[PDB]
Swiss-Prot record, chains A, B, C, D:
It catalyses: a primary alcohol + NAD(+) = an aldehyde + NADH + H(+); a secondary alcohol + NAD(+) = a ketone + NADH + H(+). Binds 2 Zn(2+) ions per subunit. This is Alcohol dehydrogenase. CDD domains: CAD3 (cd08297). The gene is adh. It comes from the Bacteria. NAD(+) binds at G172, I173, G174, G175, L176, G177, D195, K200, V260, G261, L262, R331. Its EC number is 1.1.1.1. Zn(2+) 2 binds at C92, C95, C98, C106. The keyword Zinc applies. The lineage of its organism: Bacteria, Bacillati, Bacillota, Bacilli, Bacillales.
Length: 336, 336, 336, 336
């Protein structure tokens, strides 16, 4: 089996031959057709997060492929299905959060391409109970971002409380933000999209945004206040200190700021104003299995189309180099 | 009419005589039996808050008195009723937040003892539509802190989402905390009380706390996780950097931290861990008129008893710098 | 002033000159341009409801016009605005439901066209605090049904708990249903529209329905179950016993049936299945002033277009027996 | 193994020796210490429900006992634990409802003592994933009714939306009602208890009820409206036509009526008034595994104590005929 392997942190990945996974009870083997790439894989490759991955590691948490083998007793998933192996690789099923449909918080969870070998290979293994069933409408390459950017942003907009007709602000129309934009519109929301580029403001407007702001030409918060009077919710994707503060202060009283990005250090919040304005700051990333089904259904109905460009497994270090220089407009999917 | 007046910021209040208020339509004149004092009155006297009160100012937002005069058209309040003038002196009645029962967020709101003359006098004026109706069961000295600490902490626990049988952490057993703890117990909650003193821990235990922690002898986040497994909600009264730090870390995954104190500068939060653990940070101060009714009823049912000491209007500057040195165990109420 | 008056029940309305309304404080006089007609006006003319209107009565609760005169101290509405005088003519502003933004449930409420003279006239009076401000985009004759059918069905879909992406069933594509359709579509919902005619099936599919069913040709409950597996929510507009039964049994487990129609008598429900399936049966009619602004905004943005026929005020009784035999495809509005 | 077996519906149960259960993977063998009895067992023995149990059947869904054998791969349940085998014997774990923590609605669920042999025996089998963990504080006999009556009524009060300080009404203080009012009091609610006996009125008053009503001496609807102005929520345990209407009309506008009883036929509801008052009728029985843990914790803390009388397995037909005559004051638990 060919696989791109992280041998040790910061040092380039080695495309090399390794054994195929063998199944234990409840697992299926997936012949990978595609696997999306995002910044989580980078942080997995660099090991710069608080809890580090197990080396050597096959990254990838957006693998889409065909089930070619099922272990004894797997009935729900059948050989031939097209499934996804997401970030939420497995959960305990018995804890506080598993019992209440909050599988994303399970303290015993395994994470695909981080705590366990992911889809940067020709075959990947996963538990039948946690794979995502890909709808028949969708190509594996175009769907792979939904397993990550899709479910994360869709769940964040549910968490935000924004109801149809209300205004939402999305700070950062990058990898996730350009996908967060289409979910918001499909959820009956009016969107103000905020970025730092005339190109992305054009991108956002073409993807459906009602208002696009080049944040380096207009102060976005007083433009949001002057035009729509503040937003009921704001999705903070860009988590640099300025965009986070700007996303916060765009939220009117009694509104919610949902943060979906993972910043490098702590972030300051004017708690003083937070108390007198009844504002909430909620954290949210990825989603529950039920969240996954709904996120994928929006794509199956055509309401959310990721901007994708394919790359070969061998180019994985060049995609990473390309990702650190910020020249990825959208997301890049590995093809197999 | 005798009144304690702020003529200039940070200089001592002058007890002196001044005009009785005369009513325009919709307002009532109450002769004040008692008026509580909290730190908000001092921040009005020092004017160290972003938006300052215009001088001269009669402070006091916890005034309880007897209606002795009603303007023309006052259908509700009658002469002889015992009413309270709270922090939410008035609201527009037609904005976004007034139509949805969120009067605390009205951008045109006037605040008792800050933007309008309050209860540091023998007579105060207030609109009939926004005065609190004090229940017949209670003594004006006993119920004045409910108008502030009572409704604030009760509404905070409501928005905390903590349900009967769940565990709540209250950081700061001070003016608000000792009242917050009684409300939590009355809502079926198990309480962990956290403070900086063996005496305050022995105060919270007496008031009903299931667990009381001296924060300078045990690591409180160590004890809460070891004994309870993290709390579902935490009320942050003490908003110093380390207490805010500990209160946050005591909330388990998916839980909410409600902040009720007003800090002097921004506060840092590990937004990284906030995202991965689905944690919410909500701000909450004071409560709506409906909130005020429900808070007063708990006190009318004997479930909340504020620890109160009396003082008279002339020693108002002595209670202020007694408050700044921090040995007011509970709250003080002005006697008239 | 010309007005269509109900002198007594079940006999024809008389067009007749009457006195122009006198404005007391807080009220406003409106020169009516158009006033909608629905079945509530008929029940008001026939007096066949539990609590009857006191006679003589000028019906009409969907009146749209120009304010020509404001009383003393009218704070918000200035002469020249276009407003609407809905079914909730006024509320006390003090009770349990007024304080929490549930003004529709105020036990002291007055109802336009029923408890007070409505818009079946050239001029109508209404309190400034409770008239709907029509947006500038909309012409008075097409927006009149939003005051009734628009705010009712929109609030009903909010009460239903149906979230974007989910399926809803709308039983009855009549007056309220054809408007319910568009609101649901604008809220991200997929819609199954059920009625008794091939003509209304195309009517629903014409305005956005994903599925239309002629209830007299297919079993709609088996159709809904075979095609979408039951609906999270169902809106019951047709409250004849067979449509109510079908609407209920189209709701899946854990779902909600919102009823907006007003039936003649009690209706039977399989509470046995309600208990074991976790189903809710909620009632909802009209909407609060906030609900009215939101429902009006959807029409302002062209997302809800009522199907409308004009008639002169003198044809009112022709419109009524027209209505009693089901000739009306949509709604009819009086023109002035 | 000794067991009470239903060989044929309506004909007495036979206490007879049968084969003890054999373990397949994931299951545990429990030696029953106690097993409560309720009317669900009666309807299982009479086979008078829509979907009947297949015979022969060992009833019992409140069996408490000690685990004496676990199949291989069972690691969470350990030999020696005291577990419960509730009505929710097993769920599929993948459907719409199992994914969202609503496993009570799983269409593939198996029911203890109905779809599979239950606790009317010395040994009963159950899946480890779905047994209830009995707290160490409590004796198997007094904890058995928590498995049924306890979790049902606790969930129904959670579904009722009733919040601390608000008033609840419990109609029928029999088997479920006398556990319901304890839960309500433990959740900070004020309880009006309604029955048809002065002996049960006093029983409720002894168990914590704030007001007890004998419905056959006072009109309970006028008593509730005149003493408290209607209740925000009402639990309907007695589902006879008269008490169902009384429970409904006890609910004030915007309130919720939760029904936990299983009536024999459809019940009429004045849908006309349901719409105009915005009242909800919700159905709720048994609870989720998480609900079971919270229900059991209230008993562990001593806030819910069922009224229990012991009988022996051989007297199973004599408690049944005791049950049909209505001589059961509370609940009766079989002892082994
Ligand atoms: Zn990703
Ligand atoms: Zn878990
Ligand atoms: Zn306002
Ligand atoms: Zn205060
Ligand atoms: Zn109408
Ligand atoms: Zn009212
Ligand atoms: Zn039972
Ligand atoms: Zn299931």
């Amino acid at each position: 089996m060919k696989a791109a392997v992280v041998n040790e942190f910061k040092k380039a990945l080695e495309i090399k031959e390794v054994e195929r996974p063998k199944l234990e009870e409840g697992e299926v083997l997936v012949k990978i057709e595609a696997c999306g790439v995002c910044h989580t894989d980078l942080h997995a490759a660099h090991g710069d997060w608080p809890i580090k991955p197990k080396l050597p590691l096959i990254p990838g948490h957006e693998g889409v492929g065909i089930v070619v083998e099922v272990a004894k007793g797997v009935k729900s998933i059948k050989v031939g299905d097209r499934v996804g192996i997401p970030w939420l690789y497995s959960a305990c099923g018995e804890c506080e959060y598993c019992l209440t449909g909050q599988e994303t918080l399970c303290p015993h969870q395994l994470n695909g391409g981080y705590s366990v070998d992911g889809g940067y290979a020709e075959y990947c293994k996963a538990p039948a109970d946690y794979v995502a069933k890909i709808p028949d409408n969708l190509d594996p390459v175009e769907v792979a971002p939904i397993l990550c950017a899709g479910v994360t942003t869709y769940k964040a907009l549910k968490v935000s409380g924004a109801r149809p007709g209300e205004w939402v602000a999305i700070y950062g129309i990058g990898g996730l933000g350009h996908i967060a934009l289409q979910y918001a519109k499909a959820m009956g929301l009016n969107v103000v999209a905020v970025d730092i580029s005339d190109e992305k403001s054009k991108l956002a407007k073409d993807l459906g945004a009602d208002i696009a702001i080049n944040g380096l030409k207009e102060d976005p918060v007083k433009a949001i206040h002057d035009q729509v009077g503040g937003v009921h919710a704001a999705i903070s994707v860009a988590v640099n200190k300025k965009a986070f503060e700007q996303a916060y202060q765009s939220v009117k009283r009694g509104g919610t700021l949902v943060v979906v990005g993972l910043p490098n250090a702590d972030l300051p919040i004017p708690i003083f104003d937070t108390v007198l304005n009844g504002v909430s700051v909620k954290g949210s990333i990825v989603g529950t299995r039920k969240d996954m089904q709904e996120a994928l259904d929006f794509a199956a109905r055509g309401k959310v189309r990721p901007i994708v460009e394919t790359a070969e497994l061998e180019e994985i270090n060049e995609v990473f180099e390309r990702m650190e220089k910020g020249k990825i407009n959208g997301r890049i999917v590995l093809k197999l």
